[PDB]
């Protein structure tokens, strides 16, 4: 997985859209939450496991 | 239905 | 090595002339030598797969002794047993039984022993006359025909 | 509040000794009565990271296992 | 001798089940309409059908049933006894359940 | 100021940091949840939460795994394995990928 | 030329005015039919581009 | 299906056959019988019939398809459980066969609405088809155009069939060559072109040599034109 | 139709299926809705010629 | 069963054996093919009608 | 059965027993040993693999 | 209600009371249960997926690739003929298979496999004095009930064909040769006995 | 006699190879007895160095009626309280 | 004992470095003893352990074959 | 015609034809006994690796960007693509890949990206690129396990769920030649092996390319935006930083719970025997 880059995020390799609205989510303070690159998870904006499914350099941000 | 003729 | 009978299995073909392939005496069935064969192939093998497995193992065990220990000169009680060393703070009042399952498997099957674990042999126990020997003549003295 | 949390915590729990008395049942089904576990959908569930598989194990009879079950309604 | 194992046992219970099964299909639909069977209207083409209970005698289905039940007992003792017993001893009920 | 450190995966670095993390909020759980039971027992790592005949509560482990959850951010399972030890509780935190 | 797995014949390509002639040079062999002898070479290691690139069309 | 169905239709036949030459009048009116119980009797067996004639074909195309486009069917499951469903609504649609023989419109209002949703059932084969001939390699064979004829049929015959339960249409439909053109449509089009597609997909497993591909394209476009002008 | 008779043949840009099993998002639900609202038409017209 | 091997590696028709893949003073033209042995589809096999007889005989 | 002591002597010179014996034979006692009963199982050639 | 196989087994029946008794893998190959075969591994190089001959070169073998929970196949199934000489995978998902054809032998190498068999059952052996169960709830999955009991004192010697047919032809020598392996049987035991 | 699968396959001296060697099949020693698990569930973690048996037990199956019988008094005396309110209100 | 935690991490390092190096590939699993709690065997969450932040980190090869010498030495 | 065949005819020599000395059995009951027995199968993965060699990089002369470029143009004509990627240069981007397997790859009908690919793969996997392909098995690859013994797979011509349509021949061509009237001619059934869910290993045969097909079918049609036109170097959220954020009352625990003598000292009584304990309340 990848560190967040503080506004300096340049996709490995081009991304599934996956949609071109922004989730409105609650995070709790202090909790581990994967985003996911590639776009393809089924678990909504999360990492759930698929991008080692597909051929993509798209990690998780793991922030 | 509804509109099914359409007019 | 002190475990199993290492000794390599014989074609028949060298004791028996009907299976040697320019003895004169040659029946041509193809069932016949094939099941010679792989008999002997079989067992082969497995002494052949033993001795290098062992070899292998030695390696990985000496590979294992040696190596260094990072987590020996770290911190007491993060990477480390704590200096005072390992306590026990129950209070037993019976001897725990030799049937525990959890002592078996943890000192049993391990991944060290993996080149180890899983190579046939024939056990090194004494030789019945009338299964090592008798039957062998047996088997020997079986007449073929070519017809 | 903290109310609310003992009655999310409360109610996992009730839901929690459900399923663990539900999977002690089906558990002692398998082992003892295999066919009927097969029958009723039930999972071989005896853990085999030993690596030596059960003795008396069977393929799934997923019989149950949307649109059938709305239609059939 | 050499071909009766349990494979084929087995085949053979099956067989005998799945030919009273299929035995039991047509007889079963039968059996459905003869419980529904069809009758004129009760208001006036069939008045008397009301009092057509059909109701036979009990007492006379029951002297009816004994040499079924009979035989049903005796090839229960033939088989159970069939342990410890020979065949001309065994010759009495085979002759019974015969008759 | 201190700074958190850069590195993920400090919670697998540090074995024994994260068994007297579990050590102290499961104690802390047990105490709270059954005081009358775990207020005089010291919590150790071979400690476990189950009778003498090795029958498991399930209401007390599923108190442990709100404690795990809250102490390190994570989310346990309760249908895969049930926290009827420290040890359990240790290969459970351990084992998931992002404990903090 | 071979398009998409299937050879044609005769096909005729435009190169447009308003486009960028890197190397002049290998351009204009490559168009005359020239064999360019390529030992003379170094290997530049940027992995700046990505599949399914956007390229203004 | 068939084992489910065949004892009533063997009943149903042995009465009639004791009817005719016992004189048991069950389906006599005079003294008790009712000729609308053989009529029940015999669409009860008749609509699974004609089900149990129609679902292999359709296990045909949903093999050469995967087969010739190398890829997975759409969702194997869900064709499965179609067939199922239908299978199913097969036992209680029997009445759209004797809509106008004087039902209780109670059975006729069951009846329409469980045939009418065949339809959805049926829709789900036909997009899964569909969606199993997209995004592939294809490979053109002479049981690929086959299955492609079944398509085109099956399309046909399922929508007028379709129409025949819509009731108010049925009452001027019924007994006609409205009817003949329907089921003649998707039972010798589809149900033949689909066993045709599997003689030339199994012509090396039933035949031991490959088939010529000259006489069976000619086959194939006499038999489905003929078909559609018939 | 035109995808299949123009693209997707071996010379011409196949596709690598490399999906062992479909994993769907309420599959049926869209496949249901045409047919659903025909039956609702033809339903409705019958109700009134009855 | 038929055990016979009639295909292997096919070269020198249109695309060489051997390797010009750098030789600047080398152009491959496949399109100047030549001819070779046309390649018929497999016969099926024939029946041998005694042999057959035989071995499929039961005493 | 008597074993005679020498040959116990010789056996357990040369033999230690390490391992346990699997075979529940071990648990049967003289009584249960005189109430078995010899079958003979005939094994030839095996032509049918079902 | 168990076969007196002495005098009736001899070919099949022999072969499946071989069989149940010794649990060897060839024979309990053979007589493997068609409803349920053992549930085996993932194949790896390193631990391939055994499929199992009775000494034939071949066997038809399907693969649906990596079984999964929520879906009970991973892929297609995929048939193929796994041969004999080498390792053989499935090249959709990996799997790798090896074919063991096993030989009628006791070698250490048979008893190798010994754990991927399902113990054979012996509830449908001997003869059954119960045809079918008539309700329909427990029907083709139990097994017949018995009036008689199974007898466990039978102990069982293979023969050659040639010795077995002088052992039904000549009483002397059976009892001669069964006395012999009562002997036998008591000699074991009490070595087993001195052993524990 | 054997409970687990480990135990059962780790040194096993009944094999085809011995008692052929001895050639006494006896009928007690078959293998469909010879192990059989607890019903009692028991799964696999990851200890310190090896796997670790957990054994999930949850309630015993020798309850007598006495103690159902004693564990029911509240909840009929509820039924009775309920009920009794529900007619005088 | 953490030192039994960690000379089995050591060991099961060792190990993976060692077969993948004589294998020519890399590990599989990074998970010393494979338990059902992640549900990785099915599927498609691994257990991958190769953490870094930049092409210039020391630790980058840290878990890999790349990280052990041709005699099987930790460093390098 | 050969004349009729009863094997049961002749004798067999399964069972020796004498019976063992009593002082013999218990020798060897007593020899058995005193030495370890023979392993028996164990179907644990005891140290997985990769079935599709190396996962691919990051960065470095073979990365997955390469894999991609490579689905987005798929084809197979009639014809070979007669342009010859340099056998130097596929050397150079799979180092470790000879002369003669680079020269054969470009000797095949592959584009250069594809020649590449396959290049990458054959290395990686072991694979014998000179195998010809047939219905007996469509390849080869030599492999070396974890015990070193250089072991071959053979991957085998399959068939789609129809064993009717599987080619059951015995020789390296692609005809269908033999018909079997009898398929299980032994009557010992086929088999498909249902594998144990513990028994599992991770997917490691190309696990990369699950989902792949299903991604580029819906980045085919889709539009992406250039970099130049991509905002860059927004600001930073307020509450998220590179460094995972842990409260300083963690820090100061941890900081703590170095200390090789600490205890929760929070305890209402003194659970540890610990001297220094004072009572909170
Ligand atoms: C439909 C019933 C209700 C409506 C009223 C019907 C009135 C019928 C009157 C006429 C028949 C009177 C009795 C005739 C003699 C019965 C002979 C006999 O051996 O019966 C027992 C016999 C049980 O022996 P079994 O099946 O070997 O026992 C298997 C298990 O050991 C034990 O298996 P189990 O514990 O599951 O029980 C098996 C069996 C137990 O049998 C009963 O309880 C008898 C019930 C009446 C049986 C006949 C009903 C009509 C069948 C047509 O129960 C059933 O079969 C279902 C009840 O049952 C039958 O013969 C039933 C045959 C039909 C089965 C399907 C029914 C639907
Ligand atoms: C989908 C949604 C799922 C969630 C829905 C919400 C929760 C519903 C279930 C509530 C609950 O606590 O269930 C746990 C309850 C088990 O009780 P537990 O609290 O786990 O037992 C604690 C000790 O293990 C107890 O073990 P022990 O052996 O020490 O104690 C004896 C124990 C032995 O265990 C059992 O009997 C459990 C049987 C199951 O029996 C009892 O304690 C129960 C009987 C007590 C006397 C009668 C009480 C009054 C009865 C009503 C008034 C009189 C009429 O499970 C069930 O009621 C069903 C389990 C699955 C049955 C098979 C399904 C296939
Ligand atoms: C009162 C209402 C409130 C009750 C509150 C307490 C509830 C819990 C009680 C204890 C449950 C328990 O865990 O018991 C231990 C018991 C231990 O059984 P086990 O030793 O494992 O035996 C294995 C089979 O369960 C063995 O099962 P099985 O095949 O032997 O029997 C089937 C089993 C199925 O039960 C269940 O599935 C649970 C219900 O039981 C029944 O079907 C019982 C009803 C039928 C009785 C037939 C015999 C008597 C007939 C005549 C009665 C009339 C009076 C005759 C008077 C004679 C002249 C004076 O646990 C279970 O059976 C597991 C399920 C527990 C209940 C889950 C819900
Ligand atoms: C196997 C052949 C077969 C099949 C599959 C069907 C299928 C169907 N049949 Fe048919 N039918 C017969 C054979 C068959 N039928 C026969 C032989 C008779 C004569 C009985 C007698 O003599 O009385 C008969 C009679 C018959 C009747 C009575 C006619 C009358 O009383 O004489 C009716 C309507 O009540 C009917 C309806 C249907 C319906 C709704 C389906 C549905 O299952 C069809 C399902 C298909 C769909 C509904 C999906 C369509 C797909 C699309 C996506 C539609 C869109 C396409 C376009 C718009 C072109 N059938
Ligand atoms: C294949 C099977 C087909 C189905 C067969 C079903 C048969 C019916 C069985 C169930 C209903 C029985 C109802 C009986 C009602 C009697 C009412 C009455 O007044 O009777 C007085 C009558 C009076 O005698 P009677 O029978 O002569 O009647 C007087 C004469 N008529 C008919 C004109 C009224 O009967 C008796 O007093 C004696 C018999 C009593 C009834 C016995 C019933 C047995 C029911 C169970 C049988 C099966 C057991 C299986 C066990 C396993
Ligand atoms: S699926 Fe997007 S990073 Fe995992
Ligand atoms: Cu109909
Ligand atoms: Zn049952
Ligand atoms: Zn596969």
């Known amino acids: 997985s990848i560190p967040y880059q503080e506004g300096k995020y340049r996709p490995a390799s081009i991304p599934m859209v996956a949609g071109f609205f922004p989730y409105n989510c609650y995070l709790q303070q202090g909790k581990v939450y994967s985003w996911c690159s590639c776009g393809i998870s089924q678990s909504g904006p999360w990492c759930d496991g698929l991008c080692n499914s597909v051929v993509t350099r798209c990690r998780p941000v793991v922030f | 239905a509804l509109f099914f003729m359409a007019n | 090595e002190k475990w199993a009978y290492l000794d390599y299995k014989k074609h028949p073909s060298t004791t028996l002339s009907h299976y040697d392939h320019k003895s004169k005496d040659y029946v041509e069935s193809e069932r016949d030598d094939y099941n010679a064969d792989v008999a002997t192939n079989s067992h082969n093998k497995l002494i052949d797969d033993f001795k290098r497995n062992l070899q292998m193992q030695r390696k990985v065990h000496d590979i294992l002794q040696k190596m260094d220990r990072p987590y020996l000169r770290g911190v007491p009680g993060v990477t480390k047993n704590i200096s005072a060393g390992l306590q026990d703070y129950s209070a037993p009042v019976s001897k725990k039984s030799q049937s525990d399952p959890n002592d078996f498997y943890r000192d049993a099957y391990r991944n060290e022993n993996r080149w180890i674990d899983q190579s046939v042999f024939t056990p090194k126990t004494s030789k019945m006359t009338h299964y090592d020997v008798e039957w062998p003549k047996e088997l020997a003295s079986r007449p073929v025909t070519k017809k | 509040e903290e109310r609310y949390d003992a009655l999310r915590v409360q109610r996992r729990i009730w839901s929690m000794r459900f399923y663990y008395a539900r999977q002690q049942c089906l558990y002692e089904l398998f082992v003892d009565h295999p066919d009927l576990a097969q029958w009723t959908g039930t999972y071989p569930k005896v853990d085999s990271s030993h690596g030596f598989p059960f003795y008396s194990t069977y393929e799934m009879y997923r019989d149950f296992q949307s649109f059938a079950q709305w239609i059939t309604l | ?99 | 100021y201190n700074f958190p450190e850069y590195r993920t995966g400090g919670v697998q670095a540090n074995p024994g940091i994260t068994a007297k993390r579990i050590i102290k909020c499961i104690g802390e759980r047990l105490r709270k949840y059954d005081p009358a039971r775990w207020e005089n027992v010291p919590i150790t790592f071979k400690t476990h939460f189950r009778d003498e005949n090795g029958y498991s509560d399930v209401a007390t482990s599923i108190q442990i795994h709100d404690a795990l959850e809250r102490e390190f951010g994570i989310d346990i399972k309760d249908r895969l394995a049930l926290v009827t030890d420290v040890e359990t509780a240790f290969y459970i935190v351990m084992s998931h990928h992002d404990p903090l | 030329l071979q398009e998409m797995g299937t050879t044609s014949q005769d096909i005729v390509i435009n190169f447009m005015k308003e486009g960028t002639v890197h190397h002049p040079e290998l351009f204009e062999a490559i168009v005359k039919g020239y064999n360019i002898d390529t030992s003379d070479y170094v290997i530049n290691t940027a992995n700046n581009l990505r599949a399914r690139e956007g390229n203004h069309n | 299906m068939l084992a489910t169905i065949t004892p009533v239709l063997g009943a149903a036949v042995i009465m009639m056959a004791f009817d005719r030459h016992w004189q048991t009048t069950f389906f006599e009116y005079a003294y008790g019988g009712d000729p609308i119980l053989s009529q029940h009797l015999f669409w009860f067996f008749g609509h699974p019939e004609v089900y149990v004639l129609i679902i292999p074909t359709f296990g045909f195309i949903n093999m050469i398809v995967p087969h010739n486009n190398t890829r997975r069917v759409a969702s194997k499951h869900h064709m499965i459980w179609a067939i199922y469903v239908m299978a199913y609504m097969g036992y209680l649609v029997w009445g759209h066969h004797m809509y106008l023989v004087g039902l209780d419109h109670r059975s006729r209002t069951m009846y329409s609405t469980i045939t009418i949703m065949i339809s959805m059932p049926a829709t789900i084969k036909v997009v899964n088809w569909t969606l199993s001939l997209v995004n592939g390699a294809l490979k053109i064979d002479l049981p690929f155009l086959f299955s492609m004829s079944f398509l085109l049929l099956f399309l046909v015959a399922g929508f007028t069939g379709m129409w025949l339960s819509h009731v108010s249409l049925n009452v001027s439909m019924h007994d006609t060559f409205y009817v003949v053109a329907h089921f003649h449509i998707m039972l010798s089009g589809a149900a033949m072109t689909g066993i045709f597609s599997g003689i030339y997909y199994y012509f090396n497993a039933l035949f031991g040599v490959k088939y010529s591909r000259m006489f069976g394209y000619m086959h194939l476009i006499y038999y489905s034109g003929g078909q559609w002008v018939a | 139709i035109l995808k299949v008779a123009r693209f997707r043949v071996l010379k011409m840009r196949p596709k690598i299926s490399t999906s062992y099993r479909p994993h769907g998002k309420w599959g049926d639900f869209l496949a249901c809705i045409i047919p659903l609202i025909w039956c609702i038409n033809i339903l409705t017209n019958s109700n009134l010629i009855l | 069963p038929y055990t016979k091997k009639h295909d292997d590696w096919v070269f020198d028709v249109t695309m060489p054996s051997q390797n010009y893949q750098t030789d600047l003073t080398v152009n491959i033209h496949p399109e100047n093919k030549k001819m070779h042995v046309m390649k018929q589809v497999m016969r099926q096999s024939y029946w041998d009608a005694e042999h057959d007889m035989a071995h499929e005989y039961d005493y | 059965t008597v074993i005679n002591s020498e040959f116990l002597t010789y056996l357990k010179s040369n033999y230690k027993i390490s391992f346990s014996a699997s075979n529940i034979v071990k648990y049967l006692s003289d009584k249960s040993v005189n109430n078995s009963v010899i079958l003979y199982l005939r094994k030839n050639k095996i032509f049918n693999k079902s | 209600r168990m076969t007196n196989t002495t005098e009736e087994a001899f070919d099949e029946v022999s072969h499946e009371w071989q069989a149940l008794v010794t649990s060897n893998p060839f024979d309990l190959n053979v007589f493997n249960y068609l409803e349920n075969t053992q549930t085996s591994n993932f194949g790896t190089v390193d631990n391939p997926l055994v499929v199992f001959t009775s000494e034939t070169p071949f066997r038809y073998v399907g693969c649906t690739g990596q079984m999964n929970e929520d879906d009970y196949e991973g892929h297609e199934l995929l048939f193929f003929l796994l041969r004999e000489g080498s390792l053989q995978r499935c090249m959709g998902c990996g799997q790798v298979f090896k074919l063991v054809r096993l030989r009628n032998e006791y070698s250490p190498e048979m008893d190798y496999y010994l754990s991927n068999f399902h113990p054979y059952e012996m509830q449908e052996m001997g003869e059954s004095d119960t045809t079918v169960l008539m309700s329909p709830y427990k029907y083709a999955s139990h097994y017949e009930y018995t009036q008689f009991e199974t007898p466990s004192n039978m102990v069982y010697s293979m023969v050659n064909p040639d010795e077995h047919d002088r052992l039904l032809v000549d009483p002397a020598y059976r009892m001669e040769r069964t006395k012999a392996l009562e002997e036998k049987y008591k000699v074991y035991t009490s070595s087993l006995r001195e052993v524990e | 006699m054997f409970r687990w699968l480990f135990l059962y396959w780790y040194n096993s001296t009944d094999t085809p190879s011995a008692i052929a060697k001895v050639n006494l099949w006896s009928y007690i020693n078959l293998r469909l007895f010879k192990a059989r698990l607890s019903s009692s569930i028991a799964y696999y973690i990851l200890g310190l160095n090896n796997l670790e048996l957990k054994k999930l037990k949850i309630f015993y199956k020798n309850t007598y009626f006495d103690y159902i019988y004693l564990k029911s008094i509240p909840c009929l005396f509820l039924i009775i309280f309920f009920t009794n309110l529900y007619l005088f209100l | 004992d953490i030192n039994k935690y960690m000379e089995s991490q050591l060991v099961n390092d060792t190990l993976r470095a060692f077969v993948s190096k004589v294998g020519k590939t890399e590990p599989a699993t990074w998970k010393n003893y494979s338990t059902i709690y992640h549900k990785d065997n099915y599927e498609a969450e691994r257990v991958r352990h190769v953490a870094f932040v930049d092409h210039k980190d020391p630790h980058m090869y840290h878990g890999l074959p790349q990280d052990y010498d041709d005699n099987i030495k930790p460093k390098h | 015609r050969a004349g009729p065949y009863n094997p049961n005819r002749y004798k067999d020599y399964y069972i020796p034809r004498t019976l063992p000395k009593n002082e013999e059995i218990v020798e060897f009951v007593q020899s058995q006994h005193s030495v370890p027995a023979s392993p028996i199968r164990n179907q644990r993965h005891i140290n997985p690796v990769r079935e599709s060699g190396p996962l691919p990089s990051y960065d470095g002369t073979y990365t997955m960007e390469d894999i991609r470029a490579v689905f987005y143009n798929t084809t197979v004509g009639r014809d070979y693509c007669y342009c010859q990627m340099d056998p130097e240069e596929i050397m150079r981007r799979v180092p470790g890949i000879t002369r003669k397997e680079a020269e054969f790859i470009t000797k095949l009908g592959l584009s250069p990206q594809e020649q590449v690919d396959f290049a990458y793969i054959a290395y990686n996997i072991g694979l014998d690129i000179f195998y010809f392909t047939n219905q007996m098995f469509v390849a080869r690859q030599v492999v070396t396990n974890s015990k070193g013994e250089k072991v071959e797979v053979l991957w085998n011509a399959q068939c789609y769920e129809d064993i009717a349509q599987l080619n059951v021949g015995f020789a390296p061509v692609l005809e269908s030649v033999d018909y079997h009237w009898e398929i299980f001619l032994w009557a010992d059934p086929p088999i498909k092996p249902n594998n144990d869910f513990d028994l599992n290993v991770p997917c490691t045969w190309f696990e990369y390319e699950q989902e792949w097909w299903m991604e580029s079918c819906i980045q085919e049609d889709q539009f992406n935006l250039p970099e130049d036109e991509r905002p860059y170097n927004t600001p930073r959220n307020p509450h998220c930083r590179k460094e995972l954020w842990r409260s300083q009352d963690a820090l100061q625990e941890e900081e703590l719970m170095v200390n090789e003598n600490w205890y929760p000292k929070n305890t209402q009584y003194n659970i540890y025997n610990q001297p220094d304990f004072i009572k909170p309340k």
Not at chain 5, 2 to 30: D, L, N, P
Not at chain 5, 35 to 52: F, G, R, T, W
Not at chain 5, 83 to 90: A, C, D, H, P, T
Request: proline letters at 2%; zero cysteines; aromatic letters at 22%.
């Open chain 5, 1 to 99: 001798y050499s071909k009766f194992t349990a494979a084929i046992q087995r085949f053979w219970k099956r067989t005998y089940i799945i030919f009273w099964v299929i035995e039991a299909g047509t007889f079963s639909v039968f059996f459905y309409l003869t419980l529904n069977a069809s009758s004129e209207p009760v208001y006036m083409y069939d008045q008397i059908k009301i009092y057509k209970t059909h109701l036979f005698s009990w007492r006379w289905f029951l002297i009816k049933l004994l040499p079924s039940v009979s035989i049903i007992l005796l090839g229960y003792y033939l088989q159970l006894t069939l342990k410890w017993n020979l065949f001309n001893k065994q010759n009495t009920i085979v002759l019974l359940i015969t008759l």
